[PDB]
Structure 1
Amino acid sequence: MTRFDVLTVGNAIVDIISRCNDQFLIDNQITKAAMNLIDAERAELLYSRMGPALEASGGSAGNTAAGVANLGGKAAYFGNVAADQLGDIFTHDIRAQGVHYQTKPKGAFPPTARSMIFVTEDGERSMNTYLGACVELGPEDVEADVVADAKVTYFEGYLWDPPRAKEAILDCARIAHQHGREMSMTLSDSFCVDRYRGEFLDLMRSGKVDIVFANRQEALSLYQTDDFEEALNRIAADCKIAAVTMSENGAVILKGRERYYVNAIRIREVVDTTGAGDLFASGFLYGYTQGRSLEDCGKLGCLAAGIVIQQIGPRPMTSLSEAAKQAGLI
């Protein structure tokens, strides 16, 4: 027995969500479908231009941990908030889902991170993130016992942006591997890959990271290639297991020379694509820590991803375990 199936580690963020049109993105120099990093002043400026919004707990790794708990897995999370109302909200949501979350705030300032997410009529999301208290996440926030007791530890590529989070992750990898556990990462965003391509490859090649998540764009960007087949071949050579999502074209899971394709789920209405990749990882890692085939892990991933894009907010409000059972994923 282990205490946890999946520990995740990431930027603790509250999402501020509003609808807009494509012209709004252009007028404001917001890169569509990307994670745009912003300072405190620009956050205020974008907020002043934004329509009425809804707030929902987010953060890539936070969403993933919540999705694992929703599916019936045992999940934990490390991530730093401030002692403020947004922090109280984040703390509440993730704990209310049954995730172990014990990272202690370090005061009220800087405040808890927010991402201004503009959702266009096609359901695509464009995020604009002020990292706030996330910049504080460091080695002191690693609960060594938790990493040791977790079957998989999963972290965001996004964590290379704040300064000391990488040191926490290197500690995680050491502890995880000392206990025969596995490490996993997501590439997060193509622009993040642009920033850290070489460091990400080295994490993979040195064996610090075992299982890598990417979408098509991130995989292309990792090798700065336009040839998807080459990207798949190279990613398979660089890590133990790769799981690559291809939007409305499903997913492919790679392990050495084996490839497992997962068919493209049909979506009646896309409300908001926020959290799709995060919930793919939830379904995959839940499957993986239950000992399911790689194909079934892929299927569980696409199931969760398909559900989250049919609602507002990045964490499914319906029962994923119920959906998985109806789907025969057991």
Structure 2
Amino acid sequence: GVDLGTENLYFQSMMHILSIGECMAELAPADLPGTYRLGFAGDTFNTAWYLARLRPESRISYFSAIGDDALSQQMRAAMSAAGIDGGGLRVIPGRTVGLYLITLEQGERSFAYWRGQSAARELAGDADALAAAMARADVVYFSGITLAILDQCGRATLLRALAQARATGRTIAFDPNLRPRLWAGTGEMTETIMQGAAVSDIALPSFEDEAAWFGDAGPDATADRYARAGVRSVVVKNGPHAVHFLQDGRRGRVPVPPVAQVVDTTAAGDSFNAGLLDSVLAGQPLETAIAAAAALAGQVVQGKGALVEV
């Protein structure tokens, strides 16, 4: 299946990025009326999918938990087909995966979801498995959805594993991705997101999504908030507006070219994150990485669905 390359004690033949979170089954409108196509999505998985297309010579791993039913097996097979390393997936017997259903009526999309009992909510049940997945990753990526789906013990287990990996030299990247409906309380949400910030080197907040919850006056305030948690590189997405960044005390802005013919903004942020991390792994300056990120996101906005072939 997926080529993992080779290694010695010191280096691996492939650059290695691990994404941790929930991959969702997804039913999306098909052509033939009343029908839907089964695919797979979910924020951190979307990011992994874009990364595997940007750098197919690298090792893009996904860590999560799935069930042992047919649908879970289809999910595993889809990861492999997409060039994603799912070797570390954990299997939770008696559970299945989460699901999105997208409906399309007179050209308007809406969605429903079922994920309150998904296997992925157990992804932090085995601390040793988490540590092993991270051990030789160049970058470890996770999101606020990754945090939201876990109970407090699982949140703590994940945060501890990230801190430990960070201390051994793993670069930790975080997409706060606030989704209020996935949290049982507001304070828990904002506090837990900032716990995620405290173990991360790179953070990719969105001003529009976060300002209300934290009281950020503007994107520079958002950046300051993450820097105070120890984040070394903060890259603040703000829709069609210039991307503000803050890195070790230094601010800058990167303009975002206007995007005509908007089709579907789904996964715009996930793909931005992939473009940024791809460029960072390639050793490009932060400003160059941000420009690349915006360029990819614009093409995803112009395309339909979570996984756009750009």
TM range (shorter): 0.7 to 0.9
1:179 aligns with 2:168: yes
TM-score when normalising by structure 1: 0.76
Other structure's SS at 1:247 match: coil
1:209 aligns with 2:197: no
Distance 2:248 2:193 in 1: 19
Verify the 8 A CA contact 2:102 2:109 in the aligned structure 1: no
Verify the 8 A CA contact 2:219 2:236 in the aligned structure 1: no
TM-score when normalising by structure 2: 0.80
| Counterpart residue type for residue 99 of structure 2 | R
Verify the 8 A CA contact 1:56 1:314 in the aligned structure 2: no
Other structure's SS at 1:243 match: strand
The alpha-carbon deviation at position 88 of structure 1 amounts to: 2.6
Of residues 228, 245, 255 in structure 1, which corresponds to 2:247? 255
Verify the 8 A CA contact 2:102 2:112 in the aligned structure 1: yes
Of residues 144, 155, 158 in structure 2, which corresponds to 1:169? 158
Partner of 2:98: 113
Distance 1:75 1:222 in 2: 33
Return 5+ residue gaps in structure 2 as ranges: 1-10
| Counterpart residue type for residue 201 of structure 1 | M
Return 5+ residue gaps in structure 1 as ranges: 20-50, 319-330
Partner of 1:58: 41
Task: Write the deviation string for residues 126-145 of structure 1: whole angstroms up to 9, x where unpaired.
Answer: 55342422222224273534
The alpha-carbon deviation at position 313 of structure 1 amounts to: 2.5
Of residues 10, 22, 26 in structure 2, which corresponds to 1:11? 22
Verify the 8 A CA contact 1:219 1:244 in the aligned structure 2: no
1:264 aligns with 2:252: no
Change (3 A) 1:258 1:219: farther
More helix by share: 1
Q: Percent identity?
A: 20
Task: Write the deviation string for residues 184-203 of structure 1: whole angstroms up to 9, x where unpaired.
Answer: 21111252684421122234
1:220 aligns with 2:202: no
Of residues 49, 52, 57 in structure 2, which corresponds to 1:69? 52
Distance 2:18 2:138 in 1: 8
Distance 1:5 1:274 in 2: 26
RMSD of aligned C-alpha atoms? 2.8
Distance 2:280 2:110 in 1: 28
Task: Write the deviation string for residues 179-237 of structure 1: whole angstroms up to 9, x where unpaired.
Answer: 21121211112526844211222343xx4222111111233145234544433333333
Of residues 218, 235, 246 in structure 2, which corresponds to 1:243? 235
Verify the 8 A CA contact 1:190 1:221 in the aligned structure 2: no
Distance 2:289 2:96 in 1: 37
1:155 aligns with 2:135: no
Verify the 8 A CA contact 2:142 2:175 in the aligned structure 1: yes
Partner of 1:196: 189
Change (3 A) 1:166 1:202: closer
| Counterpart residue type for residue 143 of structure 2 | E
Of residues 296, 299, 317 in structure 1, which corresponds to 2:288? 296
Distance 1:308 1:88 in 2: 28
